[PDB]
Short mmCIF file of C-alpha atoms in Angstrom, two decimals:
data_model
loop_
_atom_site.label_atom_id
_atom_site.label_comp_id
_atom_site.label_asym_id
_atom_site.label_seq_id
_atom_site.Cartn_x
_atom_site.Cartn_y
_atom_site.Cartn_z
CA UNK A 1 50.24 -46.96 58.23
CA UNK A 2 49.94 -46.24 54.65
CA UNK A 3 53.65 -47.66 54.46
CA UNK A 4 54.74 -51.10 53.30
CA UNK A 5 58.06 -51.43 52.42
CA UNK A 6 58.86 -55.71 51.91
CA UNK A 7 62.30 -57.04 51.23
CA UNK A 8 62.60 -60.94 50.02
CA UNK A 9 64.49 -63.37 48.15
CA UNK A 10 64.09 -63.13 44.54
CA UNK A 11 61.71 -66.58 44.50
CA UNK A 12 58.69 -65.31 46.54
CA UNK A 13 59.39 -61.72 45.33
CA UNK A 14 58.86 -62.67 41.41
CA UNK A 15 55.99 -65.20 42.00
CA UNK A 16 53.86 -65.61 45.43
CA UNK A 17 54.12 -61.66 46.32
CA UNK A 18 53.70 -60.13 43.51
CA UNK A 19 50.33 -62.21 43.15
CA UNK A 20 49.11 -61.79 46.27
CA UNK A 21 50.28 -57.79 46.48
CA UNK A 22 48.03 -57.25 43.60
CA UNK A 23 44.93 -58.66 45.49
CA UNK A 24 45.98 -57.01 48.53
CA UNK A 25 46.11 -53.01 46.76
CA UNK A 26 42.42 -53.24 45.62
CA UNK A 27 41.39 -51.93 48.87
CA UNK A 28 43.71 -49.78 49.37
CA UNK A 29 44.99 -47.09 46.01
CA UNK A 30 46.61 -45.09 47.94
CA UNK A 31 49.13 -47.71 49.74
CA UNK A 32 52.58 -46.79 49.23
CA UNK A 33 54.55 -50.17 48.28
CA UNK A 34 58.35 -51.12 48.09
CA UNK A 35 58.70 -54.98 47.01
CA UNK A 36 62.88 -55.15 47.38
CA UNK A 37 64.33 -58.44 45.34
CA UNK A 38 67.66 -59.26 47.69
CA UNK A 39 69.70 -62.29 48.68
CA UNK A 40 68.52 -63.92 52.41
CA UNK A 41 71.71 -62.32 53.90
CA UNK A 42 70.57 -58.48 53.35
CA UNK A 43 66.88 -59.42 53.55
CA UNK A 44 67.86 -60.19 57.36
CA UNK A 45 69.89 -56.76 57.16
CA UNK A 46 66.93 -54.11 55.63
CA UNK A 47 64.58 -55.36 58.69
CA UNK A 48 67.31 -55.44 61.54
CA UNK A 49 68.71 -51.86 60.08
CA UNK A 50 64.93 -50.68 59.85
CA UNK A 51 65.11 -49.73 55.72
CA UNK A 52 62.16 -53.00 55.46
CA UNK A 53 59.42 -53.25 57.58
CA UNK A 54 58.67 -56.69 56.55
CA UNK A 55 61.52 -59.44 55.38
CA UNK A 56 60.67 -62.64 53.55
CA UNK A 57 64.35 -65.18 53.46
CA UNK A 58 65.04 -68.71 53.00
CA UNK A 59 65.95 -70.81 56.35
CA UNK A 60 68.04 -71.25 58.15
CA UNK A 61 68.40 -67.86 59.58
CA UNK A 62 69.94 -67.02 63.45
CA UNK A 63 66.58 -65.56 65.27
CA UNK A 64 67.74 -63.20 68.11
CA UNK A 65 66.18 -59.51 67.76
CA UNK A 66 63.52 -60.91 65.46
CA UNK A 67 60.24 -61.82 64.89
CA UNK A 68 59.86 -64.95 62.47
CA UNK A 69 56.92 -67.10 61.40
CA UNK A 70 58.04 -70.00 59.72
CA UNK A 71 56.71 -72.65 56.74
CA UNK A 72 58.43 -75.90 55.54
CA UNK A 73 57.50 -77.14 52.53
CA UNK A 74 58.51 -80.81 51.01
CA UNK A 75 60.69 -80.61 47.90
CA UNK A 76 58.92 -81.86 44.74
CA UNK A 77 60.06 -82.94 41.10
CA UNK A 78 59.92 -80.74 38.25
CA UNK A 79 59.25 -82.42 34.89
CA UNK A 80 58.22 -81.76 31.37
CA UNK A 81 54.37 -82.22 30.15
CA UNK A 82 53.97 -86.00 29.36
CA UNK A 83 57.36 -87.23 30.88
CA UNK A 84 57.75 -90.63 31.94
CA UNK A 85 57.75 -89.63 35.50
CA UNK A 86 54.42 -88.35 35.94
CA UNK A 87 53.43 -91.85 35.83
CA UNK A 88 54.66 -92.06 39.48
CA UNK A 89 52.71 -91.08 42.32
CA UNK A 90 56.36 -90.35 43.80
CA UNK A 91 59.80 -89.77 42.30
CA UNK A 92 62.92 -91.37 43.67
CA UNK A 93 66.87 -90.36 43.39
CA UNK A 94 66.77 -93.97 41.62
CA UNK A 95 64.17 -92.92 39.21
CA UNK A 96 66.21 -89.99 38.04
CA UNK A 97 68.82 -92.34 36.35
CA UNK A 98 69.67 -91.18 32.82
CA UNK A 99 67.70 -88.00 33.21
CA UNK A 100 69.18 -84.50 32.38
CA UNK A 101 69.30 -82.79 35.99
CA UNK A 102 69.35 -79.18 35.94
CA UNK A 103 71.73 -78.19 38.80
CA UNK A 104 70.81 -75.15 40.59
CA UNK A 105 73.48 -73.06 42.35
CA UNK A 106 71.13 -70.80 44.12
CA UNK A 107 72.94 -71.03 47.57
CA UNK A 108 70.26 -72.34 49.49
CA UNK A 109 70.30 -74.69 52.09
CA UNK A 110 67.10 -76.47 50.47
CA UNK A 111 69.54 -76.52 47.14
CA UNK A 112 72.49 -78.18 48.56
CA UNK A 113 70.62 -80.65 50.42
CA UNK A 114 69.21 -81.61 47.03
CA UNK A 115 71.99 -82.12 45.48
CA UNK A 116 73.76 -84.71 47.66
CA UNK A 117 70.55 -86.00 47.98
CA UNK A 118 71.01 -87.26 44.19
CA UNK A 119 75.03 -86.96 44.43
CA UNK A 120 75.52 -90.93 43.18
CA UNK A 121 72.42 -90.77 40.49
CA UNK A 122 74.00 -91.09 36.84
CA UNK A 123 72.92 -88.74 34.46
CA UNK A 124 73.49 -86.70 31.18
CA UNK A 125 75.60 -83.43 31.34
CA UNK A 126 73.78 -81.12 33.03
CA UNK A 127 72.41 -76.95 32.70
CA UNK A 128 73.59 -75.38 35.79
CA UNK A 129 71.76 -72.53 37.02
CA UNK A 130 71.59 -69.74 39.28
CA UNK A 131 67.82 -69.36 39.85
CA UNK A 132 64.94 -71.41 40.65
CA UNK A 133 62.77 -69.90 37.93
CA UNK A 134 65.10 -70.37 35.23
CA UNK A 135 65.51 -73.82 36.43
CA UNK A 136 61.63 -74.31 35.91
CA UNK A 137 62.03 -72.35 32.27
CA UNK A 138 64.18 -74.63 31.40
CA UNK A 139 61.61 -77.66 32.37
CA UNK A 140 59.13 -75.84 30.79
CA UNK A 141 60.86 -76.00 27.34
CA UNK A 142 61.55 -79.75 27.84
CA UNK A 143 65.68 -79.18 28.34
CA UNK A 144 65.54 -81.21 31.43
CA UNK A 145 64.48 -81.69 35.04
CA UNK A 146 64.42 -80.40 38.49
CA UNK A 147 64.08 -80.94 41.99
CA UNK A 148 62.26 -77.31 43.64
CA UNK A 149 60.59 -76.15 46.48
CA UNK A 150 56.44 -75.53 45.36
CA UNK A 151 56.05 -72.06 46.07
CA UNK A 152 58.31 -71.36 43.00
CA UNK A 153 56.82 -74.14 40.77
CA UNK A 154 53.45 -72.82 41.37
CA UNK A 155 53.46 -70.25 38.46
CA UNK A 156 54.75 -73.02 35.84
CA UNK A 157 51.59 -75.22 37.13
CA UNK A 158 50.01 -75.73 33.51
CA UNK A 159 52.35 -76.61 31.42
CA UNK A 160 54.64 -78.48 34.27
CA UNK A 161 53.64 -81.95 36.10
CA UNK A 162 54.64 -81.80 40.03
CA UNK A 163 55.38 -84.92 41.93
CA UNK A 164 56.65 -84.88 45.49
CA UNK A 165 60.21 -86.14 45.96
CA UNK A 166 60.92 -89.77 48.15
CA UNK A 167 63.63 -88.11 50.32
CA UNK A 168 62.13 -85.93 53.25
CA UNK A 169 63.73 -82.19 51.93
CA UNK A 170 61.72 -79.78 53.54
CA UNK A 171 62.25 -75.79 51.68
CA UNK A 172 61.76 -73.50 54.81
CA UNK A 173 60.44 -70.28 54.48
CA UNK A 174 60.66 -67.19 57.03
CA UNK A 175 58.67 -63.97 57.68
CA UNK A 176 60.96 -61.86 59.40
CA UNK A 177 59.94 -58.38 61.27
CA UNK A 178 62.25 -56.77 63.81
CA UNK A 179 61.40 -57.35 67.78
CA UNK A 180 61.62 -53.66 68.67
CA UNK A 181 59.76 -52.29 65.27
CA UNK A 182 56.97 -49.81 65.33
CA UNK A 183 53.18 -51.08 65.79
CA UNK A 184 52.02 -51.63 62.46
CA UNK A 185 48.14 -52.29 61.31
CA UNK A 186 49.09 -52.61 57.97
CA UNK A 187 52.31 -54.89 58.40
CA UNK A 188 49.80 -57.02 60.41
CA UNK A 189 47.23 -57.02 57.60
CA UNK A 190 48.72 -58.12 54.79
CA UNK A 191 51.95 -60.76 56.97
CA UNK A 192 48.34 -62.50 58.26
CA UNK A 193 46.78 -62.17 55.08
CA UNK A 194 49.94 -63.69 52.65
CA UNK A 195 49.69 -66.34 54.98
CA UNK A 196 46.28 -67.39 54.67
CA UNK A 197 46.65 -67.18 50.94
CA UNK A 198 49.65 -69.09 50.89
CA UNK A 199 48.71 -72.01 52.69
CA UNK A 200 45.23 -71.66 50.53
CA UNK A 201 46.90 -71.77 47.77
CA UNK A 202 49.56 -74.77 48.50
CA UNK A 203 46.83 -76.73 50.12
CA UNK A 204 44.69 -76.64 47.16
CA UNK A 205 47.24 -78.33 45.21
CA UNK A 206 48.34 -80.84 47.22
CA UNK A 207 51.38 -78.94 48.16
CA UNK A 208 51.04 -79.07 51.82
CA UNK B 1 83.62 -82.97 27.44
CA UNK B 2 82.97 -79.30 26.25
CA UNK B 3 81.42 -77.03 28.94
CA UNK B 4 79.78 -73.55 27.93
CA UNK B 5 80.35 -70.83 30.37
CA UNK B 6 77.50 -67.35 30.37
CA UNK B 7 76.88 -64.79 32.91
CA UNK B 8 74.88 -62.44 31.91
CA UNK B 9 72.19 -59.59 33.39
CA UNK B 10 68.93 -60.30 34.79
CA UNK B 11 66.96 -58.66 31.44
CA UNK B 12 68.23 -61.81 29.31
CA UNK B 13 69.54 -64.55 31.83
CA UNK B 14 65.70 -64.66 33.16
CA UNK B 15 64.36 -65.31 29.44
CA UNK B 16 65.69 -65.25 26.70
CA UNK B 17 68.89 -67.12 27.18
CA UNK B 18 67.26 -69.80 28.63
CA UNK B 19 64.77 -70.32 25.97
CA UNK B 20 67.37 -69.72 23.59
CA UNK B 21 69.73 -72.26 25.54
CA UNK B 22 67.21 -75.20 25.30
CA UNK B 23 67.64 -75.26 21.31
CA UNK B 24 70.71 -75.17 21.27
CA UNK B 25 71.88 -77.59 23.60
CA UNK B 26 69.25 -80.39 22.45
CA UNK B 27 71.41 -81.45 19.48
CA UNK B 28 74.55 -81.13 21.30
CA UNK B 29 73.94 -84.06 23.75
CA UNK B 30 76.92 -84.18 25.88
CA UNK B 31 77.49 -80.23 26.25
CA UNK B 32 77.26 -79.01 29.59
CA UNK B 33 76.43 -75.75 29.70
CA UNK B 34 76.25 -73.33 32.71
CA UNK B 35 73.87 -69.82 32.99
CA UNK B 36 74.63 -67.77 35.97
CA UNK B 37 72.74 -64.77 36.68
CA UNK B 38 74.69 -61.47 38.00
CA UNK B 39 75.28 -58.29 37.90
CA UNK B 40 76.35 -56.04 34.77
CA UNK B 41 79.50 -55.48 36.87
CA UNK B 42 80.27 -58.84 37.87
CA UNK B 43 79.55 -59.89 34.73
CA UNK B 44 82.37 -57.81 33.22
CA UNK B 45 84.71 -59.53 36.17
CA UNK B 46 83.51 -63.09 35.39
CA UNK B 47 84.16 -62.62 31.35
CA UNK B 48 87.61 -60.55 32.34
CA UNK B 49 88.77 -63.52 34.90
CA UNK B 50 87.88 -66.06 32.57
CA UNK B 51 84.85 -67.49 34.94
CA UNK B 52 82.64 -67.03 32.06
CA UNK B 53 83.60 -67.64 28.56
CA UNK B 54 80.20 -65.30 26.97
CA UNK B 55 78.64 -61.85 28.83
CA UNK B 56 75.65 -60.14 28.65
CA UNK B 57 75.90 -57.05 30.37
CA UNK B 58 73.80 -53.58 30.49
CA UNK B 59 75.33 -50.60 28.91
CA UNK B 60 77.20 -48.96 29.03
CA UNK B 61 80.30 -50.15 30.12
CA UNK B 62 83.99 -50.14 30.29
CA UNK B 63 85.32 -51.19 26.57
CA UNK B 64 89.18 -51.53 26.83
CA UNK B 65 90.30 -55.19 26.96
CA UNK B 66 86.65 -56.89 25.70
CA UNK B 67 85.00 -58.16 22.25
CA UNK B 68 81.69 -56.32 22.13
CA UNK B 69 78.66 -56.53 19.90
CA UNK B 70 75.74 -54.42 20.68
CA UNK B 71 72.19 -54.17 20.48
CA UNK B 72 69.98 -51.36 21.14
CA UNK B 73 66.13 -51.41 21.48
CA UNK B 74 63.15 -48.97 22.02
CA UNK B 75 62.22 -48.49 25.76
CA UNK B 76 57.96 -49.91 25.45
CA UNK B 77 55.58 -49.67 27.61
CA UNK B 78 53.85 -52.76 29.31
CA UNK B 79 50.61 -52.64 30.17
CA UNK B 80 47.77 -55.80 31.53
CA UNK B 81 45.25 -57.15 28.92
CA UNK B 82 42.74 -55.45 28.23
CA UNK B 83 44.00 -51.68 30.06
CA UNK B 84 42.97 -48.49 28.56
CA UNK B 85 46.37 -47.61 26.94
CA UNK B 86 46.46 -50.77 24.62
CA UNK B 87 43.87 -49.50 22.50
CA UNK B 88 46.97 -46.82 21.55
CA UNK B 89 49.53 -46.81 19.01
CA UNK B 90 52.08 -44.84 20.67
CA UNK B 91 52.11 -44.14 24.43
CA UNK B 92 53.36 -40.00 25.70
CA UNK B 93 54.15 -39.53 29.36
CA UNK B 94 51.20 -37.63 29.26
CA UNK B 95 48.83 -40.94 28.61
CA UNK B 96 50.19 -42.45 31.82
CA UNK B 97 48.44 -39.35 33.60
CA UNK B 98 46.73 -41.13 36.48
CA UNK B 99 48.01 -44.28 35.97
CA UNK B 100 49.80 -46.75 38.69
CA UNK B 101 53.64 -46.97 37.30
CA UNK B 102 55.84 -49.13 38.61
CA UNK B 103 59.11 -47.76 39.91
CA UNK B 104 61.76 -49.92 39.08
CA UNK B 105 64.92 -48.99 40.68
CA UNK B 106 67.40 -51.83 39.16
CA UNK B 107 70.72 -49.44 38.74
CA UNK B 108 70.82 -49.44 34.96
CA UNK B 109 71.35 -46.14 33.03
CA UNK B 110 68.07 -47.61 31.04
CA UNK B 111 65.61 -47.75 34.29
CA UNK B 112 67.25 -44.22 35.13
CA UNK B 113 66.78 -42.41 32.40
CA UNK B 114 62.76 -43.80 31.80
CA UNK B 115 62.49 -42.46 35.80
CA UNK B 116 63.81 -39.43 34.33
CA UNK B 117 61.61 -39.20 31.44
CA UNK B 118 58.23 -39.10 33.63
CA UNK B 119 59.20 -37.47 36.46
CA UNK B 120 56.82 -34.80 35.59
CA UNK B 121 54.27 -36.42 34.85
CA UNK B 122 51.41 -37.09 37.99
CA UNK B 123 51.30 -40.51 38.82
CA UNK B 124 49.52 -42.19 41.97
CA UNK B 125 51.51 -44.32 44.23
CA UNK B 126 53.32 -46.87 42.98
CA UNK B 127 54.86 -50.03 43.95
CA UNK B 128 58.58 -49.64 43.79
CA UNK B 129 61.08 -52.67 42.73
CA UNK B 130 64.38 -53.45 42.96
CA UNK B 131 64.18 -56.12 39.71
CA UNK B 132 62.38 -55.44 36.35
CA UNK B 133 61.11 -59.34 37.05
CA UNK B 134 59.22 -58.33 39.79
CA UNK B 135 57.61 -55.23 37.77
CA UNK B 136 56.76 -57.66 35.02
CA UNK B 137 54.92 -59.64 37.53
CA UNK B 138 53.13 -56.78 39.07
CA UNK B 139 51.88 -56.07 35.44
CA UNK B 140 50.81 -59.41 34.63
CA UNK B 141 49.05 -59.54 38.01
CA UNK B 142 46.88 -56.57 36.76
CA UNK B 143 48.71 -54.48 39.59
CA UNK B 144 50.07 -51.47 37.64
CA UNK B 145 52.15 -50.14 34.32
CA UNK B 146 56.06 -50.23 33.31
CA UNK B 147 58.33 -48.76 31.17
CA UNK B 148 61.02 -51.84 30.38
CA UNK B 149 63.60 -53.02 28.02
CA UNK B 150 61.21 -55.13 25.60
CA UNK B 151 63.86 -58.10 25.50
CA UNK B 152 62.86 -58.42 29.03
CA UNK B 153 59.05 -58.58 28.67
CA UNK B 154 59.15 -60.63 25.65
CA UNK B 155 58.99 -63.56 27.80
CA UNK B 156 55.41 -62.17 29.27
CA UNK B 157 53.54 -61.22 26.32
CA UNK B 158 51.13 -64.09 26.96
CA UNK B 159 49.40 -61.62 29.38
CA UNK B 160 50.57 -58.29 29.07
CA UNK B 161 50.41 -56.01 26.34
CA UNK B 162 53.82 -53.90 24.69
CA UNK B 163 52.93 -50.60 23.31
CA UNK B 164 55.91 -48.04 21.97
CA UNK B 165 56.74 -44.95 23.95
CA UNK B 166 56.96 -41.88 22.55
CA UNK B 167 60.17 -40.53 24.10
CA UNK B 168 62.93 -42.70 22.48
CA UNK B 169 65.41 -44.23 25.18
CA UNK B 170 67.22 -46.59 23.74
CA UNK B 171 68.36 -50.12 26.09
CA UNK B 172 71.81 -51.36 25.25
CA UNK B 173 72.73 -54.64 25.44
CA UNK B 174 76.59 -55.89 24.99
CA UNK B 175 77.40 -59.10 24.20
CA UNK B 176 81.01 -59.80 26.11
CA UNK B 177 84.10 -61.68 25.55
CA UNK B 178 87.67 -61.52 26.29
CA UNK B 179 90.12 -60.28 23.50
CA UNK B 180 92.84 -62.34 25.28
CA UNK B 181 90.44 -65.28 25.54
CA UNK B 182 91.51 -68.54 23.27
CA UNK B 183 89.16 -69.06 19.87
CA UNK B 184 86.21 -71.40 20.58
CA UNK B 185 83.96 -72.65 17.83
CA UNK B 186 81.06 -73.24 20.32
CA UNK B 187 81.18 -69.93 21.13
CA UNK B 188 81.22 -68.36 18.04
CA UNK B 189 77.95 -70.50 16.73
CA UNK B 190 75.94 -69.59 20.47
CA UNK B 191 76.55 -65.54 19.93
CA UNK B 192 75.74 -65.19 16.57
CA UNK B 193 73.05 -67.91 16.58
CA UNK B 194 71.47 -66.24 19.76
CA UNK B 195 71.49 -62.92 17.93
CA UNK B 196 69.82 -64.13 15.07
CA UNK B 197 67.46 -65.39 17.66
CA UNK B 198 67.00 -62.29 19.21
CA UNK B 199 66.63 -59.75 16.10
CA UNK B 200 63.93 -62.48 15.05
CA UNK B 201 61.64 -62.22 17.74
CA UNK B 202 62.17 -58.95 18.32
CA UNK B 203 61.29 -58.15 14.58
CA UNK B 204 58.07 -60.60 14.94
CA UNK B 205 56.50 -58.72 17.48
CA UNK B 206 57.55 -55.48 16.07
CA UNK B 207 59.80 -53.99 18.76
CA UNK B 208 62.81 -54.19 16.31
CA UNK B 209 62.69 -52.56 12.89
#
């Protein structure tokens, strides 16, 4: 009970968990904690082979011998402090004509669904990527735009203008535990916990 | 319809590259460029297979067949604003008595060594990562202390604090192409303008002399 060992993709696990983890170990100094940065595919592995009590992995995942609470979250337009399209309440594919796109190979679903989403819009030669945070660097120093989930915008909120995106892309998020692991107090705790601070936090602004 | 090709490590494709990458590209309008992330071993395999015209890989690693320049910086300690330990000049493994240090358990011969290096040392329980981004975080957040690569944490000195550490363990960082691999112009001006970006910063803030 004085174990919590958490395996997620690297996008909550550098930016949502880390913040909240650090709110969360004020009670308690001497919690043991193991914050694991993987890929969805051996997120879904460390909780069904018991090495994570707690798993945190991008949708769509296949459910049977877990537990999974689930959160979808609209995508939403990345772009640089005083850009032209912060003037719109919300962003089009049509609106991103001419624009430098930052392509992000990340292997999501939420990625790829993006991208054909936008697959006729013209546009300059692009920065491809491999992560959503260096995407949002990349914003950040005015190379270009993007088109993200919140949850990994949310730490690029003051120097980065967020405007949700005209086609209905929802980024799914899952909270995976195993359906035969040990009763946990502390696994209880904190999955209800990151929750409620979570949907605080996306609530507040205007994310959800 | 040139197209730049990197791969390189987590401790410069997270920031440095990429805030490197955004000067260089803005005058060179209809360069495509791609940055993907990976492992020092795949990134030897992606420069090798010709996937990835530039590499940035951990050391050390296997020379034969590759064009390698390296750099090698002071380990540092990073510590949240305002902590105890960055009133200090220096910081011994005996100053981190007490203190919550992150474990960061990323593979590298860098990360193992620090482990090494204050294994003896008491510390309460920590909060153990897989990615040096994640310990950076957990800094920031106020939620511990690191020993890192200061290339790494460069990109976080907005809210943490970099102090030098006492034992000297050295990161190495290779800059990788192929010897069989065509000249390129484009690539010549991003490695050695990148590295004169590099040794800049790092000489501005002190953790390069």
């Amino acid at each position: 009970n004085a174990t919590l060992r958490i395996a997620a993709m690297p996008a909550l696990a550098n930016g949502l968990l880390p913040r909240f983890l650090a709110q969360f170990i004020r009670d308690r100094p001497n919690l043991q904690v193991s914050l694991m940065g993987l890929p969805s595919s051996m997120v879904m592995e460390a909780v069904a082979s018991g090495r994570a009590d707690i798993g945190y992995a991008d949708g769509p995942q296949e459910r049977q011998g877990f537990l999974i609470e689930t959160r979808s979250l609209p995508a939403v337009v990345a772009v640089p402090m005083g850009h032209r399209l912060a003037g719109l309440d919300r962003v089009t594919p049509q609106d991103l004509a001419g624009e430098r796109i930052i392509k992000q190979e990340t292997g999501t679903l939420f990625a790829m669904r993006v991208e054909v989403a936008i697959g006729g819009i013209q546009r300059r030669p692009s920065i491809e990527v491999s992560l959503s945070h260096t995407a949002l660097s990349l914003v950040r120093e005015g190379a270009g735009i993007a088109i993200i989930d919140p949850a990994a915008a949310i730490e690029f909120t003051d120097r980065i203008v967020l405007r949700p995106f005209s086609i209905f892309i929802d980024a799914e998020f899952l909270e995976v535990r195993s359906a035969i692991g040990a009763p946990s107090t502390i696994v209880d705790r904190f999955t209800t916990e990151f929750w409620r601070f979570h949907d605080d936090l996306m609530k507040q602004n205007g994310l959800m």
